[PDB]
């Protein structure tokens, strides 16, 4: 896009004072044509002779993907029960976890969805006809860990 400081003929024209397809399209509305055939003045050239000085803007989109960071010393998991999940059977006693995050401003309220990846064991047994039993256990975050 145009470099608005190092282009010396940069005029900031608003939507109202932009024209392009003059005489062949409506005035700021999906309605019938209006105006006269006339030179445009809207986009600034970025190509060919008479191209304006420009800046570079770069970004990415990730849609349908949650960011994930494995809890493994090397950040690839070669087993579902991580190597640092098994250093918490000898060097654990409970620790605090504080996570800080920096996000872009949003003009509306947003939520952060943090998922703490665990084991959800749903385990079920029948010992007799018409009898069903179960025990449900999870490891780093679990229910029934401060009440019966």
């Amino acid at each position: 896009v145009v470099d608005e400081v190092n282009y010396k003929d940069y005029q900031a024209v608003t939507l109202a004072y932009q024209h392009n397809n003059s005489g062949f399209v409506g005035y700021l509305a999906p309605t019938m044509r209006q105006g006269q055939p006339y030179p445009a003045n809207y986009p600034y050239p970025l190509i060919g002779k008479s191209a304006v000085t420009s800046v570079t803007q770069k970004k990415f989109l990730c849609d349908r993907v949650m960011w994930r960071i494995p809890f493994s010393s090397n950040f690839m998991s070669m087993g579902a029960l991580t190597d640092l999940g098994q250093n918490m059977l000898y060097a654990n006693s409970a620790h605090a976890l504080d996570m800080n995050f920096e996000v872009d401003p949003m003009d509306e309220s947003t939520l952060l969805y943090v998922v703490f990846e665990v084991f959800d064991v749903v385990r079920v047994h029948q010992p007799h006809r018409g009898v069903i039993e179960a025990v449900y256990l999870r490891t780093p975050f679990s229910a029934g860990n401060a009440t019966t």
Partner: peptide
Amino acid sequence: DINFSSLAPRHGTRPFMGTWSDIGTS
């Protein structure tokens, strides 16, 4: 990965003469 090791017994298929049959608990 996201959790999926919830897999079968790591058997192999039962041996036969003429490609298929059933032997049950044998």
